Point group: C2
Chain length 353, copies 2
């Protein structure tokens, strides 16, 4: 049986979902928020955030249903949700308000763009931006996985105003993504995903084990330094639980894989992948794009490495073991591997240890 | 991977029988357990006391011959540099669970030290036979061993509140937590011929393990949905939910070393019942005095437990006893929904 609060039990009715899909989305949204934000004080903001995480979950599953251009419009209901009102309840009167409005809209925009019928030019530029540098992969994946959004929401649901610096958010995202992308590796590869750190860094277990161990070690140093503050614990709770959801949430396949993690041949998500089978402009969406994404989507073709292998159209069918975007050259792949292996110096700098 | 813990504990357990590597592994392991089990707290003083109590628990697991079990509950006494009874008073004194938690702590460390003596004591054999006598008894004794109700009570105390769970809430929570934890620790426990694993008794087929892990986790999500708005509710949730997850979150476990995977297959005068009975909680006092006439005679018992492939080190249940255990674990939903006040 799936469980979630009565408050949300009638959400997402009459939106194009089966009763099975709808109850799975609501349970997933609730579990994600409980796992990522276990400590809260404000129930009204907590439920608003659960509802926004439900819409995010719909955007990932069936993005065609979500009117991206209405998410930030006051008075507008998207699949029954007053999205801008929920964002205002959560973030209005905090220092991160205007930035989190663009973070939310930008995340859902590219979730919808990636499910689309045919590759848009926004999609193609995103696919090439994330392959263009490791720091740009981490910033854009941060938005895609809602890392800094969850951290700020966690602080807001404790009735405090987030005061992390830009470099603290970048350190937190690099730790969380390095862990999460490692555990999701086999699901993401079986689905020929573009948004996985190891699509660019390399598929060898030895690299993954090494940088996982370093990120978890830095996270334990961060936890030891920050655990006496509510804001500190709000960031720790979110980052630490990112990989653990593979075991804690009923959306993942821990039980169905024989109580295993990291074994692709017993995996229910990999076996599902194996068994399986009107154009938004930069102009129309720029109001909602955060600055790093705007620059990411306008990087000149010529200022990117010309040795890496791009294509006209990404997606379509691929062999077992292949991810779905830009294939880095040896020099670029060496650049990424070296950036990730250097995390400890960069982060002890960025986090103020 | 360097080890991290607070400065308040960094020079504990100095020059008292641990190697230098052992001592820092113990302090880091205690800190990591307490941070995973009790993520939400308000009282730093109580928190460090509990971390130090966990460090001593960790010495008893590893090196129980260093630990003077009979001085744990004695005012004024230092064990390995810790004023154990002062630490337990800082954490629990003036709560409704004070006396129960002194006994819960001492009873845990007593059997951790008994399990590693060179010679099996009488007391150790009676524990090994008691934990195999009924599934409800397995869960209560494993609760103390794993410190499930002690951690839940400590979590509430570290939020400056008075634990007010009922006996039957503690029993449901222990059943949920142990069913999950013993499942994830299954292969490690089997490799060490452990006695304290639910599946040593229920059986070793993966299908039973999957099914009852799915139910326990589903119950825990219903409990979390019902209780997540109070500090006491979250204190319980956080401990139970994180029990299986420490296999990924703690450096003590082998997630990384295993390829980012879970699941991959007479120095000593003997203690007597009478010398330790003051420190035992009621159910353990009773379990250690059960006549083996009142136990199932068809189960396979031994004169001496231990020695030795893919075998646990205690009582081997008979087919009928195994069926009783499996039925009990598979009936958890109804028992738990009743004990937890969902109906
Ligand atoms: Zn290149
Ligand atoms: Zn029997």
């Amino acid at each position: 049986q799936l469980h979630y609060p009565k408050e949300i039990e009638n959400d997402l009715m009459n939106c194009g979902l089966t009763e099975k899909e709808r109850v799975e989305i609501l349970a997933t949204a609730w579990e994600y928020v409980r796992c990522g934000v276990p400590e809260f004080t404000n129930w009204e903001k907590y439920i608003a955030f659960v509802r926004l995480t439900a819409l995010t979950t719909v955007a990932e599953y069936r993005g065609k249903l979500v009117d991206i251009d209405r998410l930030l419009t006051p008075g507008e209901y998207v699949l029954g949700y007053p999205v801008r009102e929920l964002l205002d309840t959560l973030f209005a009167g905090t220092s991160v308000y205007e930035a989190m409005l663009q973070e939310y809209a930008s995340c859902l925009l590219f979730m919808a763009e990636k499910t689309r019928d045919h590759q848009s030019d926004l999609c193609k530029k995103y696919i090439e931006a994330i392959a263009s540098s490791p720091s740009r992969y981490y910033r854009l994946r941060d938005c895609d996985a809602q890392v800094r959004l969850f951290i700020a929401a966690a602080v807001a649901c404790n009735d405090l105003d987030p005061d992390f610096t830009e470099m603290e958010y970048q350190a937190m995202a690099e730790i969380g993504i390095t862990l999460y992308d490692a555990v999701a590796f086999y699901k993401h590869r079986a689905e020929a995903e573009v948004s996985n750190l190891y699509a660019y860094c390399g598929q060898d277990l030895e690299f993954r084990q090494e940088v996982y161990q370093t990120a978890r070690s830095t996270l334990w140093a961060l936890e030891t330094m920050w655990c006496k503050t509510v804001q500190g614990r709000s960031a720790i709770n979110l980052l630490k639980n990112l990989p653990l959801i593979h075991m804690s949430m009923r959306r993942y396949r821990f039980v169905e894989d024989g109580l295993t993690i990291g074994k692709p041949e017993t995996s229910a998500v990999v076996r599902a992948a194996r068994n399986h089978v009107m154009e938004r402009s930069f102009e129309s969406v720029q109001y909602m794009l955060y600055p790093e994404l705007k620059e990411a989507l306008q990087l000149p073709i010529t200022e990117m490495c010309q040795k890496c292998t791009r294509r006209e159209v990404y997606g379509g069918v691929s062999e077992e073991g292949q991810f779905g975007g830009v294939v880095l050259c040896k020099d670029s792949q060496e650049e990424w591997r070296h950036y990730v292996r250097s995390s400890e110096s960069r982060h002890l700098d960025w986090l103020g240890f």
